[PDB]
Design a protein around this ligand. Sequence first.
Ligand SMILES: CCCCCCCC/C=C/CCCCCCCC(=O)O[C@@H](COC(=O)CCCCCCCCCCCCCCC)COP(=O)([O-])OCC[N+](C)(C)C
Ligand SMILES: CCCCCCCC/C=C/CCCCCCCC(=O)O[C@@H](COC(=O)CCCCCCCCCCCCCCC)COP(=O)([O-])OCC[N+](C)(C)C
Ligand SMILES: CCCCCCCC/C=C\CCCCCCCC(=O)O[C@@H](COC(=O)CCCCCCCCCCCCCCC)COP(=O)([O-])OCC[N+](C)(C)C
Ligand SMILES: CCCCCCCC/C=C\CCCCCCCC(=O)O[C@@H](COC(=O)CCCCCCCCCCCCCCC)COP(=O)([O-])OCC[N+](C)(C)C
Ligand SMILES: CCCCCCCC/C=C\CCCCCCCC(=O)O[C@@H](COC(=O)CCCCCCCCCCCCCCC)COP(=O)([O-])OCC[N+](C)(C)C
Ligand SMILES: CCCCCCCC/C=C\CCCCCCCC(=O)O[C@@H](COC(=O)CCCCCCCCCCCCCCC)COP(=O)([O-])OCC[N+](C)(C)C
Ligand SMILES: CCCCCCCC/C=C\CCCCCCCC(=O)O[C@@H](COC(=O)CCCCCCCCCCCCCCC)COP(=O)([O-])OCC[N+](C)(C)C
Ligand SMILES: CCCCCCCC/C=C\CCCCCCCC(=O)O[C@@H](COC(=O)CCCCCCCCCCCCCCC)COP(=O)([O-])OCC[N+](C)(C)C
Ligand SMILES: CCCCCCCC/C=C\CCCCCCCC(=O)O[C@@H](COC(=O)CCCCCCCCCCCCCCC)COP(=O)([O-])OCC[N+](C)(C)C
Ligand SMILES: CCCCCCCC/C=C\CCCCCCCC(=O)O[C@@H](COC(=O)CCCCCCCCCCCCCCC)COP(=O)([O-])OCC[N+](C)(C)C
Ligand SMILES: CCCCCCCC/C=C\CCCCCCCC(=O)O[C@@H](COC(=O)CCCCCCCCCCCCCCC)COP(=O)([O-])OCC[N+](C)(C)C
Ligand SMILES: NCCOB(c1ccccc1)c1ccccc1
Ligand SMILES: NCCOB(c1ccccc1)c1ccccc1
Ligand SMILES: NCCOB(c1ccccc1)c1ccccc1
Ligand SMILES: NCCOB(c1ccccc1)c1ccccc1
Lengths: 63, 231, 640
Amino acid sequence: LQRARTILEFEKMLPEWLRSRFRMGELCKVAEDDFRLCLRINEVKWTEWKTHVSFLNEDPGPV
Amino acid sequence: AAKMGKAEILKYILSREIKEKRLRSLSRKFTDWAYGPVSSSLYDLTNVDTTTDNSVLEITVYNTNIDNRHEMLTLEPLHTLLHMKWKKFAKHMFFLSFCFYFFYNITLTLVSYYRPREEEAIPHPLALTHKMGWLQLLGRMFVLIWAMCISVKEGIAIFLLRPSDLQSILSDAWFHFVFFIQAVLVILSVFLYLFAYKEYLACLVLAMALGWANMLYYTRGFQSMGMYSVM
Amino acid sequence: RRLKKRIFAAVSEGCVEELVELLVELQELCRRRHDEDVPDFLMHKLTASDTGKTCLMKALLNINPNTKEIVRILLAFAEENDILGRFINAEYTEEAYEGQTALNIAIERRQGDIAALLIAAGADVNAHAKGAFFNPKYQHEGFYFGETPLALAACTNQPEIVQLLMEHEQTDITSRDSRGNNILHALVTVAEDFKTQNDFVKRMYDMILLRSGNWELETTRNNDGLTPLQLAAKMGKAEILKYILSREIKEKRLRSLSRKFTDWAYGPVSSSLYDLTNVDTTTDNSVLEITVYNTNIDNRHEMLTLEPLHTLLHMKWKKFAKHMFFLSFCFYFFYNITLTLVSYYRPREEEAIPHPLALTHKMGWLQLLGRMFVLIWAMCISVKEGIAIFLLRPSDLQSILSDAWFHFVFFIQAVLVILSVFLYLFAYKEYLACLVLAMALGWANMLYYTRGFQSMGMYSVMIQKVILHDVLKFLFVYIVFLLGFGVALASLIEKCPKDNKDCSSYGSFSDAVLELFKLTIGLGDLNIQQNSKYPILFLFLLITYVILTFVLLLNMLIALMGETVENVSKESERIWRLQRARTILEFEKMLPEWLRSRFRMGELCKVAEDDFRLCLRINEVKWTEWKTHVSFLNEDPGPV
Ligand SMILES: CCCCCCCC/C=C/CCCCCCCC(=O)O[C@@H](COC(=O)CCCCCCCCCCCCCCC)COP(=O)([O-])OCC[N+](C)(C)C
Ligand SMILES: CCCCCCCC/C=C/CCCCCCCC(=O)O[C@@H](COC(=O)CCCCCCCCCCCCCCC)COP(=O)([O-])OCC[N+](C)(C)C
Ligand SMILES: CCCCCCCC/C=C\CCCCCCCC(=O)O[C@@H](COC(=O)CCCCCCCCCCCCCCC)COP(=O)([O-])OCC[N+](C)(C)C
Ligand SMILES: CCCCCCCC/C=C\CCCCCCCC(=O)O[C@@H](COC(=O)CCCCCCCCCCCCCCC)COP(=O)([O-])OCC[N+](C)(C)C
Ligand SMILES: CCCCCCCC/C=C\CCCCCCCC(=O)O[C@@H](COC(=O)CCCCCCCCCCCCCCC)COP(=O)([O-])OCC[N+](C)(C)C
Ligand SMILES: CCCCCCCC/C=C\CCCCCCCC(=O)O[C@@H](COC(=O)CCCCCCCCCCCCCCC)COP(=O)([O-])OCC[N+](C)(C)C
Ligand SMILES: CCCCCCCC/C=C\CCCCCCCC(=O)O[C@@H](COC(=O)CCCCCCCCCCCCCCC)COP(=O)([O-])OCC[N+](C)(C)C
Ligand SMILES: CCCCCCCC/C=C\CCCCCCCC(=O)O[C@@H](COC(=O)CCCCCCCCCCCCCCC)COP(=O)([O-])OCC[N+](C)(C)C
Ligand SMILES: CCCCCCCC/C=C\CCCCCCCC(=O)O[C@@H](COC(=O)CCCCCCCCCCCCCCC)COP(=O)([O-])OCC[N+](C)(C)C
Ligand SMILES: CCCCCCCC/C=C\CCCCCCCC(=O)O[C@@H](COC(=O)CCCCCCCCCCCCCCC)COP(=O)([O-])OCC[N+](C)(C)C
Ligand SMILES: CCCCCCCC/C=C\CCCCCCCC(=O)O[C@@H](COC(=O)CCCCCCCCCCCCCCC)COP(=O)([O-])OCC[N+](C)(C)C
Ligand SMILES: NCCOB(c1ccccc1)c1ccccc1
Ligand SMILES: NCCOB(c1ccccc1)c1ccccc1
Ligand SMILES: NCCOB(c1ccccc1)c1ccccc1
Ligand SMILES: NCCOB(c1ccccc1)c1ccccc1
């Protein structure tokens, strides 16, 4: 919690033009006319095996 | 859920993935692609990332009224956003803050104890004179500015411009005072010497003793060094 | 145009009835050409132009409840136009998907009924998906499974389709991809722990090996040059390496695929034989050699615990490695004493001090045998470590610099003995300075020989763990408490030039810091506290300095008890046994060719018809499970 306070106090020190450069997220079309700044986190799960029907891109890969 | 510390409700809302169609837009967790065991997820950051007035990441860290902030910042977007800010700019700013302050404590010692004079009616340090040299000129100019750059900035923090010292600073942020007191006593000892008082040396020793004492703030850059300083 | 996009969309949501007239509209346009362009033109309108995705690939990526009937319509249309062969065996033209077919899609989407229908329709069961997604760069840019449809069904836990593919006789089980891997190399790569996945990759290894029934799959090496037995030792896959190395097949006609054989059994007492073909250190790359010298994995203690790797590493210690370790101790303990006796046991008045190890006459055979022993043994280390660290296989990329730091300190101590002789003959003033650092490092290197005993060895690891990792935590907080009271006490100390008769101080700040060293180590006085400005105020900062020092010493003990007092004793016990395991295999390389054959383990055991293997015997007494014994080599029990 001492580091987590230190990170957010360093972000307030930055100017307006430099906070936009280090901004996280990307525009992802999650629905019809719904663009959200989403952040990607990958996961490798071996235990549960299901067929995949809920997805945004049918082509797998960071393209 | 971020203000009251309700971690199990805050875990559900922040990672809500609705599989059934026509209610897909009520989700905050989306799967972009999947191939066997490898899958890619997308976490919504509408009111979570620190780009608005009140965000979930800002409320959770600065909440000194709850006792479960470690259980709430462990959650997968709040963990990752707090980790990606460290790798981009916060580790570089923390090391850069260490370099200007470690040079600040040495220069206070070199102007106070590295001058052998017989008596010469002892001059107080940080007193800008001529005929001296650019080595000592760049030294005392660095100490004079950096003592004021802390005193003004901490003068914004503790005082009138959003003082925040009700219970916020006085609970988990006690380092704001000790950087402020050390910055004043450098400036105040110069004012006592120009006003011809006998307390110019006494305020300077407590300024240098508190200056090396405040080096324990920079122990939080490492985990093993940081956990040892908490004990 | 509009005709192409409607066919791609109709196979996506599941409009079965809409797809009917769209294939009729594609069929009504065929009667304006002849048979040279009609099979060509249908490939342009059923596939893409930039990626190569077909209508069959689009329907299988979108799993809908009408996915079974929609495949039967599209494949029947290709049969009527006699284009079924190039339709089902189509591939992506994309660089990140090159080689992926429609069969690779249906296997991953858990469609066993559709994948059985594609193979009967004529799909290629030996498709090689050589794209950039299926062969990643370092980690997690994709998913490497083996680039074959047999490996995709095996690595995604689909045992019904693996049995379907092996019965099909166009399936080449011994196929090798761009990485040189086959079906058994790829199962070692994707394998993980039992907590991580399951034990299913061990069961997939069992099913495929028994169907082949030969020693062709575990003998073939990849482009790197490793067997599937040697990838388990290189990558650190302990659960797969446990299964292969102790594989006992009970069912006959596949008995020769075993690496564990039972020689005899009588009730609870049984005798086993472990195969040592590529395990014992008699070839170039062996399992015992790869596992010990692998500084890229963090589970060497779990792999050398296994029953033949434990026993071979223990039998080498009892035969020659304990005797060589004690003999190395005796020549080096005599080496450190003789350096001291030639340097401090000579009382001479001045006589223009002679440097030691200088061979003169008229001296005696006591000192002659002494200095000749030191001169040779310093060169015997410097040449041998000159082979190790340097040109003759230097190996200092990450191998020596990770778990073998003793190679440098024996080398530096050997040079400084030789270099100090060279500085004295060249008439320089550094002959004595290099000799003291040679003797101080010589007694410091006696901690290498602590690994002969367990209790002595575990204690020396804890010393190396505190100094290299945990002392800089103590020091960096000590100096800020040193200089915190250092600038405070320096203003209290009255200046030394009061008399200047015995004044040899180094400054006001230097007097305050040096007294805080002496008061910590226990050599402090009270001469400055009496002759100070404020004597009572000078004492209270010294009392506070002791309290802060005791807090620093008391939190070092809590930090060395981090979260469990047992796990500190565990990590010093695991990495001690790797220091002995490296020491055993380095002593084996020192032996000549005729002497390694004398201490070789194993014996010829006829395990099958014309199958003689160097097996090692390990006895076992098991009381829990009671079975009748039908799998045995000798019907007469006993070591005869
Ligand atoms: C005359 C008597 C002789 C000396 C007495 C013995 C001195 C030995 C002192 C040793 C220091 C350690 C214990 C002190 C108290 C904790 C540190 C602190 O200030 O709080 C904060 C800063 O912590 C930092 O890391 C920044 C500065 C550290 C030292 C500040 C000076 C303290 C001495 C004062 C005067 C010394 C005299 C200087 C001359 C004027 C802790 O960080 P936080 O962000 O708030 O989060 C934790 C919240 N919590 C703690 C509430 C859980
Ligand atoms: C001037 C300052 C005053 C003295 C300072 C205090 C000295 C006190 C020192 C105390 C020794 C203990 C800590 C030292 C570092 C660890 C031991 C080591 O070297 O590595 C190896 C040697 O394995 C040995 O144990 C043999 C030699 C031990 C001492 C080597 C000299 C180090 C002194 C330095 C110069 C002293 C001056 C000598 C004169 C030139 C450890 O074995 P390993 O096979 O690599 O496996 C472990 C791998 N791991 C560690 C990466 C996990
Ligand atoms: C406008 C344009 C500007 C130009 C460009 C600007 C950019 C250039 C900026 C910077 C230049 C280049 C930097 C590159 C990255 C290095 C940063 C780094 O090392 O991180 C360190 C931060 O830094 C510190 O923590 C320093 C403080 C030392 C720790 C304790 C000593 C102090 C207390 C005792 C007193 C002793 C002192 C002596 C006695 C008084 C540590 O971070 P980390 O550990 O690596 O993080 C990993 C997290 N982990 C912990 C989980 C592992
Ligand atoms: C890293 C740990 C050790 C740190 C260094 C050891 C500490 C001290 C080193 C040595 C002890 C004393 C020997 C001489 C001191 C240097 C020169 C001098 O005399 O100072 C003079 C000015 O001083 C200043 O105003 C500027 C500071 C000078 C640079 C020294 C610290 C650099 C550390 C970088 C830190 C940045 C962070 C780095 C990233 C971590 C003092 O004035 P003077 O009385 O008139 O002296 C006359 C002599 N003269 C004419 C020749 C000038
Ligand atoms: C030189 C550079 C410096 C480097 C130093 C090292 C350099 C060399 C590197 C490594 C060698 C280290 C020493 C040898 C091995 C020691 C370990 C050991 O176990 O001892 C074994 C010695 O081995 C024997 O079997 C004894 C045979 C001696 C007869 C020699 C005559 C012919 C060889 C010609 C000789 C000249 C060579 C060829 C020249 C023409 C004894 O076995 P044991 O276990 O004790 O079993 C007894 C137990 N029991 C009685 C209960 C049954
Ligand atoms: C070419 C023909 C050659 C002729 C024939 C050649 C053959 C004849 C050869 C040899 C002659 C006969 C030997 C027979 C077997 C005895 C050896 C032995 O005991 O093994 C010892 C090895 O040896 C050492 O470890 C010595 C080092 C002592 C450790 C601590 C002192 C060093 C550091 C402190 C500094 C203090 C020193 C003073 C201050 C500087 C230990 O092994 P073990 O423990 O018994 O093994 C059991 C494993 N256990 C751990 C599970 C229990
Ligand atoms: C085991 C723990 C204790 C170790 C022993 C205690 C340490 C020391 C014992 C006593 C302290 C000093 C008293 C006299 C020293 C002996 C003789 C001498 O004078 O040395 C001389 C030569 O020295 C050499 O070159 C050879 C070494 C001599 C044998 C001594 C160590 C044997 C240990 C075996 C270890 C192997 C491994 C064993 C397995 C573990 C010194 O030369 P000098 O200055 O000209 O002296 C003139 C006197 N003189 C003419 C009479 C020669
Ligand atoms: C200018 C820049 C800033 C400079 C100031 C700061 C510099 C940084 C200084 C200390 C912080 C450590 C940073 C290392 C890398 C970061 C990763 C990390 O988390 O640290 C870890 C990596 O452990 C190490 O690598 C220790 C660093 C020393 C390496 C060897 C130097 C020789 C020691 C010479 C010694 C002196 C000779 C002795 C006699 C006099 C440390 O973790 P740990 O401590 O092992 O905790 C484990 C305990 N537990 C499992 C129970 C929890
Ligand atoms: C964690 C790291 C370490 C932490 C910090 C280390 C411990 C910090 C503790 C103490 C810091 C140092 C205290 C003394 C400083 C001045 C000494 C001096 O020079 O005396 C001189 C100045 O004379 C005076 O004016 C003051 C004399 C002492 C006043 C004592 C009050 C402070 C006690 C502590 C309470 C403070 C509360 C602190 C908060 C708890 C006397 O010299 P003179 O020639 O006879 O008189 C002529 C005057 N002239 C020279 C200017 C012309
Ligand atoms: C990594 C630390 C070790 C290396 C850096 C050393 C840092 C400095 C530490 C100690 C000083 C050692 C070198 C400086 C000058 C020589 C001696 C001296 O002090 O006396 C001088 C005045 O005496 C004073 O009163 C000056 C001391 C105050 C300024 C020095 C501390 C700087 C910041 C604190 C440390 C910040 C960094 C600490 C972070 C850990 C006069 O010298 P002399 O007595 O007449 O003798 C002649 C000198 N000669 C023979 C050498 C020619
Ligand atoms: C962690 C515990 C360590 C202490 C606090 C740690 C922080 C330390 C910081 C600041 C501490 C406070 C600084 C006080 C300065 C001394 C002034 C004084 O007393 O008058 C006189 C001494 O007269 C005496 O002799 C009094 C006896 C001294 C000890 C008291 C007995 C304790 C019994 C009760 C049990 C309670 C035990 C204590 C409470 C725990 C004069 O003393 P002087 O000034 O040196 O002489 C100069 C003359 N001049 C002024 C005319 C020039
Ligand atoms: N498992 C450790 C996760 O660490 B957390 C963390 C995240 C980013 C940077 C540094 C640490 C963390 C956990 C609770 C509160 C605050 C931060
Ligand atoms: N001195 C004005 C700001 O100080 B900084 C600062 C002040 C007190 C505590 C911690 C940091 C600073 C921040 C980032 C980089 C460099 C310095
Ligand atoms: N149960 C203790 C077995 O010890 B092992 C061992 C084997 C031979 C000689 C000495 C020790 C061992 C275990 C893991 C790694 C390396 C060696
Ligand atoms: N000095 C040349 C070889 O040294 B040996 C050696 C040198 C350094 C560290 C460990 C061993 C040696 C090995 C076995 C028996 C005797 C000596």
